[PDB]
Symmetry: C2
Subunit: 99 residues, 2 copies
């Protein structure tokens, strides 16, 4: 689908068998989601932002279905007030910017 930007580009995503609403974030390199119960192993990681940084648990090869499409990649789980879908996943569902 095509989406304008007068509102936040929020989509429904299915991850870890759970549902969530997330933002299609073209400015985010990574995909970061609020605390969600994901199975398995992970590595502690640091990621910076506008306010600075947060430490997050890094899960690799996580399958997500964004708005009806499938993609596998790294998902960072840490203290973020919003669920963000980054370019690593946006490139997989064939998302592009147009203007």
């Amino acid at each position: 689908p095509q989406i304008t930007l007068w509102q936040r580009p929020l989509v429904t995503v299915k991850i870890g068998g759970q549902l969530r609403e997330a933002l299609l974030d073209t400015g985010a390199d990574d995909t970061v989601l609020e605390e969600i119960n994901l199975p398995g192993k992970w590595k502690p990681k640091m990621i910076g932002g506008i306010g600075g940084f947060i430490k997050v648990k890094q899960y690799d090869q996580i399958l997500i279905e964004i708005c009806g499409k499938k993609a596998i990649g790294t998902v960072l789980v840490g203290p973020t007030s919003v669920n963000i879908i980054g370019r690593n996943m946006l490139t997989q569902i064939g998302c592009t910017l147009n203007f």
Copy 2:
């Protein structure tokens, strides 16, 4: 221009007589620029992101040129790690997401 996300969505923007590169950011409601000399007065404001909040200067009705297109609106200048063109400006250049 149709922009793919394999790389950060950078664009050349002209603001206040100066040239800068800025990240087209759908995950940003606002436009936030790093250290830059901007004429006039403003209204202090604090915005949040990942890692906490940052104090910025809020300038209104600022002409901005992203690629070949002009837009006028609020711009925030602060300690940001990257110049960001948020939805307040993106809508104005008809920027859209597609997948």
